[PDB]
């Protein structure tokens, strides 16, 4: 009763309850996946068309940080955007002192340390977002997914949203089919497939698919949006597969 | 750090703490004020009666603010010390910057000012103090009597009473002080102020303190003998 009320007070048995509660917010959000490839990394999110009044490709939820790190999130959608600010502030701060873009493992650590503060004190609220962010630098590609607790892990692939289960089982099967790492050029196509399957869950409102990629081979380490003809080939490929 | 709101509005259109403020005043001592036409008289009863308790060095409940302003206070007595302090401060910073002593009007606003401004900040309870302010305007003869609230409101009065059992002495004053005809002299006023206190003091002259302020910085106290004399006079006449 009184451990339920409180923030940042340990339960008798030893767990924080409001970390657990903060997970709920991740499952309300829409699907998003990352796929780590041999070249770099692909990001993709399901953007729900909740009315005929929204405009197409103008209410983009994919947001870069610097010019080599893709970011898309699930949780509470204002609360996402403010962590994409925080990231920018730290990114930029590193470029002043050490004159080089920030390394991707380092980008992870400091971003995490912010989340961690809001479970240290009782006075601000534990952040209600699970994020995917990653990109390529000199060490290579890295994928990360950050949980509201303040924990990240590296991954061959990761996913988040209400349709995480349906993507997690295909993602094993894209570690079996291609055990040496598929090319990122193949993986535009493979990304679409995994959104079109995890849309039966959110089949309530029709969708619009968004991919983006950052890889050393294609885009010269510069994160971009897949657009025009390359976006048309991936759409028609996953649509005719799942029907 | 502490700024937690203590002026929680009452849904009935009030503020709980400002009622309580008025209550704490009622607990404490009594004090009466009356304005003749050339004097003011501040009497207050003193529970400093208690064999083996000095009165030379114990502080009286009527305080001197300035040469020609005097204050009397009912309510919490720990608290009284502050409003004296602030008013003294004021009285000098007025001379410094504008010249000329404080107009009694002005000093009234200013004490009133301080008590309001403790309901604004969260970190602080209201002063549970009401006061009588009296004096005579610089280079004039105009009696003035003012009284303020722990609300912060203020008004001049012909005579007033605050503290415990204020209803008895107000009801006494309605009959016995005409609004068109003040008591003529200084002795006739003082006889009238004693007679008001001797309703709630239940005789004795040792209890009550009577200070008079007149125009031209005349702040004087009546000593035990004088008090007794007046009391006795009121005794013979009343008896007869």
């Amino acid at each position: 009763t009184g451990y339920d009320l409180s923030n940042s007070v340990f339960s008798p048995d030893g767990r924080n309850f409001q970390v657990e509660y903060a997970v709920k917010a991740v499952e309300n959000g829409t699907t998003s996946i990352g796929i780590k490839c041999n070249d770099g990394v692909v990001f993709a999110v399901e953007k729900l068309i909740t009315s005929k009044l929204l405009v197409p490709q103008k209410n983009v939820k994919i947001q870069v940080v610097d010019r080599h790190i893709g970011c898309v999130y699930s949780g509470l959608i204002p609360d996402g955007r403010h962590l994409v600010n925080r990231g920018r502030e730290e990114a930029a701060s590193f470029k002043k002192l050490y004159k080089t873009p920030i390394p991707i493992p380092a980008f992870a650590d400091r971003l995490g340390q912010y989340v961690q503060a809001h479970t240290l004190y009782n006075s601000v609220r534990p952040f209600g977002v699970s994020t995917i962010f990653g990109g390529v630098d000199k060490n290579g590609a890295h994928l990360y997914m950050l949980e509201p607790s303040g924990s990240y892990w590296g991954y061959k692939g990761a996913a988040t949203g209400k349709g995480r289960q349906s993507a997690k089982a295909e993602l094993e099967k894209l570690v079996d089919h291609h055990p040496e790492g598929l090319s990122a050029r193949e993986a535009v196509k493979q990304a679409a497939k995994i959104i079109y399957l995890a849309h039966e869950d959110n089949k309530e409102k029709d969708f619009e698919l968004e991919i983006s990629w950052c890889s050393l081979s294609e885009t010269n380490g510069l994160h971009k949006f897949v657009k025009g003809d390359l976006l048309q080939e991936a759409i028609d490929f996953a649509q005719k597969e799942i029907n | 750090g502490y700024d937690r709101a203590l002026s929680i509005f009452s849904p009935d259109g009030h503020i709980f703490q400002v009622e309580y403020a008025l209550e704490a005043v009622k607990r404490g001592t009594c004090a009466v004020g009356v304005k003749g036409k050339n004097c003011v008289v501040l009497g207050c009863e003193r529970r400093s009666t208690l064999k083996l308790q000095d009165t030379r060095i114990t502080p009286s409940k009527v305080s001197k603010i300035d040469s020609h302003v005097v204050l009397s206070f009912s309510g919490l007595n720990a608290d009284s010390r502050i409003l004296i302090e602030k008013a003294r401060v004021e009285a000098q910073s007025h001379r410094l910057t504008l010249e000329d002593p404080v107009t009694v009007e002005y000093l009234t606003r200013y004490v009133a000012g301080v008590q309001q401004r403790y309901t604004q900040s969260g970190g602080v309870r209201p002063f549970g103090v009401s006061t009588l302010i009296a004096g005579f305007d610089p280079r004039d003869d105009e009696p003035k009597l003012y009284q303020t609230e722990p609300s912060g409101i203020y008004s001049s009065w012909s005579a007033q009473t605050i503290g415990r059992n204020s209803k008895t002495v107000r009801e006494f004053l309605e009959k016995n002080y005409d609004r068109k005809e003040p008591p003529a002299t200084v002795e006739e006023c003082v006889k009238l102020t004693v007679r008001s206190l001797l309703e709630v003091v239940q005789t004795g002259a040792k209890n009550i303190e009577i200070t008079v302020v007149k125009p031209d910085s005349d702040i004087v106290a009546l000593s035990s003998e004088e008090i007794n004399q007046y009391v006795t006079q009121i005794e013979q006449e009343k008896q007869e």
Partner: protein
């Protein structure tokens, strides 16, 4: 830059010039060196122009805010001791102040106060500040009486600025008079300093010395 003011019977006469130089170059000859602080105080402009104009408008604001606040109009002595204690704060920052604040109230009578940059604040009956501080004293003090007709007192002001204006380089332009009564200052207007010289040279018969 001659500003003078003398107490007399009916109240105060203010009198000023209007030639305000910047260097050898004569900038402008229209500069009204009175500052109407409200309709019962008049404040002169001598010393540095910026520090003076601006800061007595700001004095004008504490007048419309003492006046509402007690509902009693500001005393002349009290107004001054505001202004003084403000510029004392900035002492040693090159701000340059020479004003007379003149008023007549019914609690103090006609009273001049002279506020100065050091913080010196003097009451007195005659003050005269600026370039024409010594010429102006001289003409004025012979002919000066505590008893005088108001009309004569206006003509005593003309002649005082006149004298400083002739001999001094930076005094010239036009003359201005004001007459403080209790009720307020009334403006007695502007006489050109080049028409005024020739009336008084002939009419009186002084300035023989001057050719023409």
């Amino acid at each position: 830059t001659t500003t003078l003011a003398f107490r007399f019977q009916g109240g105060i006469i203010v009198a000023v010039d209007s030639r305000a130089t910047a260097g050898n170059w004569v900038a402008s000859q229209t500069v009204k060196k009175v500052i109407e602080i409200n309709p019962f105080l008049l404040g002169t402009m001598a010393g540095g122009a910026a520090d003076c104009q601006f800061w007595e408008t700001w004095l004008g604001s504490q007048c419309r805010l003492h006046e509402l606040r007690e509902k009693e109009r500001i005393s002349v002595a009290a107004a001054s001791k505001i202004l003084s204690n403000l510029v004392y704060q900035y002492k040693g920052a090159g701000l340059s102040m020479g004003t007379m604040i003149c008023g007549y109230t019914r609690k103090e009578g006609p009273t001049i106060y002279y506020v100065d940059s050091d913080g010196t604040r003097l009451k007195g009956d005659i003050f005269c500040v600026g370039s024409g501080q010594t010429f102006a004293y001289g003409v004025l003090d012979s002919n000066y009486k505590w008893d005088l007709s108001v009309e004569d007192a206006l003509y005593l002001g003309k002649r005082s600025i006149l004298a400083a204006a002739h001999r001094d380089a930076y005094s010239g332009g036009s003359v201005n008079l004001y007459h403080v009564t209790e009720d307020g200052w009334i403006y007695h207007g502007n006489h050109d300093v080049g028409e005024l010289f020739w009336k008084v040279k002939e009419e009186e018969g002084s300035f023989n010395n001057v050719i023409g």
